[PDB]
Every structure is written in C-alpha cells, then in structure tokens.
Structure 1
Amino acid sequence: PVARTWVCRKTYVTPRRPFEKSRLDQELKLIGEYGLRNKREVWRVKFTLAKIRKAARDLLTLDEKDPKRLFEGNALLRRLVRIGVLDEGKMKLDYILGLKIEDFLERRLQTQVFKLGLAKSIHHARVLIRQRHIRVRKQVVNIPSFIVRLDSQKHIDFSLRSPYGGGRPGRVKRKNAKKG
C-alpha cells in the first residue's frame, strides 16, 4: 500500500507487417516532410487518430438523436476543431472519418514554427524549439510534439531571453566577442 498510481498507457502500436515496402516508404515520407526523429512518432500520431476514428465509429452506429451520441459527439468535434485538425464548417461525425495523419502532423509545434517563418527548415525548427527559443503565449515550450490549437497559434514567438528575440546573445557570441 503506497500513495502511487501505476496508471500508464502506450502511445503507439507497432504495425503487423514489419518489412512491407509500401508502408516503409509511406512512413519515411512523413518523417522527412515533418522532421520527425523515428517511426515511433509516426505510429504515435497514427495511434491517436485510430482512437479518434474508433470513438466516431461507436457513435455513428447509435441513433441520430441518442443522448450519448449528441454529447460525446460534440465534445469530440470541439476538440478536433480546437486544435485546428477539423474545420468549423464540418461539425458532423461523418467528416471525422475523413481525417488523415497529415492533419495532425501539420498542427505539431515544429511544423507551426516552420510555417510561421520562425525557422528556415522543418529540421531547423525542432532544434530551434529544443534549444529553448520558441515560446507559446509567454511559456517556453521545449517539446516539438506540442499540438498547437487555434487560440495558441497567433501567440507563437521567440522567448524573451533568446539571442534571436530580445535577449542576451549566446555563449558563442559572447566568447567570440571578448577575444577580439
């Protein structure tokens, strides 16, 4: 008896076919396009959407005016349109099944800070975030998988202590300055 939880959960699922060339080239196409580290991050986003589609599958089988479908359906739609994956014009459970992996990969932090012009490349973005430069509405976010929602997208900027922002230059600039 201890004051602990032991409540964990795996955030990915390994595919059944380990060496299928159709999937190996598809996943690698998403890694280079969005600057990912390995295949686990692809299977992670694939596992999140696979759970969202399963939630929509359980609701679409219910009656149209079922109280559980109306409540949990709107809650599922609100969280999808909040993070920018789903559009406000499509507020029906039928359009959830039309989502793809790239819809969630475009909402990751390193993708946003690359589309916002803060980074010169998608790989420059991840290193830019991991080095404590990108902040979200006065909060230094260090995680590239930070799924940016709509109300937090207009507040992505450099940190107030970054050499790129309004801060003291790094140790390389300060050491190369005291030399000459």
Structure 2
Amino acid sequence: PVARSWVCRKTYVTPRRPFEKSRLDQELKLIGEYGLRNKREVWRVKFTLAKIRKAARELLTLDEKDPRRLFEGNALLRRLVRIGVLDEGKMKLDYILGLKIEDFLERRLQTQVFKLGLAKSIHHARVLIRQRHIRVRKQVVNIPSFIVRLDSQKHIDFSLRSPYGGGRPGRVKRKNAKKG
C-alpha cells in the first residue's frame, strides 16, 4: 500500500491504416501550416475533437429538454466558446459537429505568437516560446501547445527578463561586447 495514484491516460490514437496516401499528405500539410514536431502532435488534436464530438453525439440523442442534455450541453458549449474555437452566436449543440482540426490548431500559443506579430514565421514562434521569451499576463510559458483562451489572448508579450523585452542582452551579445 502506497500513497500514490496510478491514473494516467493516453492523449493520442494511431490510425488503423499505417501507410495510406492522402492521409499522409493531409497530415503533413497540417504539420507544415503549424510547425508541429511529428505526427503524434497531429493525432493528439484529432483525439480531443473525437472525444468532443462523441460527447456531443450522445447529448443529441437525448430528449431536447432532458436535464443532462441541458446541463452538459451547456458546459461543453461554454468551453469551446471560451477557448475561441466556437463563435458566440453559434451556441447550439449541433455546430460542434461542424468543428475541424484547424480550428483547434489556431488556438495554440505558437500560432498566436506568429499571428500577433511577435515572430516572423511559425518556426520562429516555437523557438521563441521554447527558450522563455513569451509570457501570458505575468507567467512565462514554455509550452508551444498552450491553448490560449479568448480573454487571455491580448495579454501576450515578451517576458520582461528577455532581451526582446525588458532586455538584459543575451549571452552572445555580451561576449561580443567583451571581445571588442
């Protein structure tokens, strides 16, 4: 008897057909548009939408005035609106079935850093995040797959202890200043 917890869970699912042309092409396009590391980063986001769609497929079978459909149908819509994947006016339960992978991949912090003009490519943004140059309101974030919420989106900046922000110059500028 130990005082631990063994609850864990996988975040992705491998496809059933391992070498299927027109799946490889589409996933490589999704990597290239967003600058992902491998195919598991794509399958991770396929897995969250497949769970969201399974959760909405069962609420759509219950009675329209059932308390579970009204209660968990409104929590599921609130989260999608909050992280910016749905629209405010589209808060019926049937528009969840019209969501796509790219709607979730837009809300990564890496694409938000690229799209807010902090970086100049989708690969400059990941390498900016990973070496501690971006913060969200006070907090330096290291994680490229940080799903930005709609209210915490305009608070993205350059992390005051970084050369691009408050600006003690880096290890390389300091050495070149010492040299000559």
Task: Output the TM-score relative to the length of structure 2.
Answer: 0.99
What is the CA-CA distance between 1:167 and the residue it aligns to?
A: 2.1
Distance across 2 between alignment mates of 1:152 and 1:30:
25
Shift of 1:139: 0.3
Q: Deviations over 1:39-95 (max 9, x none)?
A: 001000000000000000010000100000000000000000000000001001100
For residue 103 of structure 1, give the secondary structure of its aligned residue in structure 2: helix
Partner of 2:130: 130
Q: Which residue in the other structure is 2:17 paired with?
A: 17
Q: What does 1:11-160 correspond to in 2, within 5 Å? A: 11-160=11-160
Measure the CA separation in 2 of the matches of 1:27 and 1:108.
Answer: 17
SS in 2 for 1:102: helix
State the distance in 1 between where 2:99 and 2:147 align: 16
* % same residue: 98
Which stretches of structure 1, 4 residues or more, deviate above 2 A after TM superposition? none
Aligned residues: 180
- For structure 2, the residue ranges without an aligned partner over 5 or more in a row are none
Q: CA deviation at 1:128?
A: 0.3
1:90 and 1:103 mapped to 2: Cα distance? Answer: 14
- For 1:111 and 1:45, the matched residues in 2 are separated by 15
TM-fit CA distance, 1:15: 0.3
> Structure 2: how far apart are the matches of 1:39 and 1:179?
44
The secondary structure found in structure 2 opposite 1:21 is: coil
The secondary structure found in structure 2 opposite 1:114 is: helix
| Partners of 1:142 and 1:13 in 2: CA distance | 25
CA distance in 2, matches of 1:152, 1:68: 30
Q: Quote the offset at 1:156 in angstroms.
A: 0.5
Q: Secondary structure at the match of 2:163?
A: coil
- 1:157 is displaced (CA, Å) by 0.6
**Any stretches of 5+ residues in structure 1 without a counterpart?**
none
C-alpha distance in 1 between matches for 2:165 and 2:104: 28
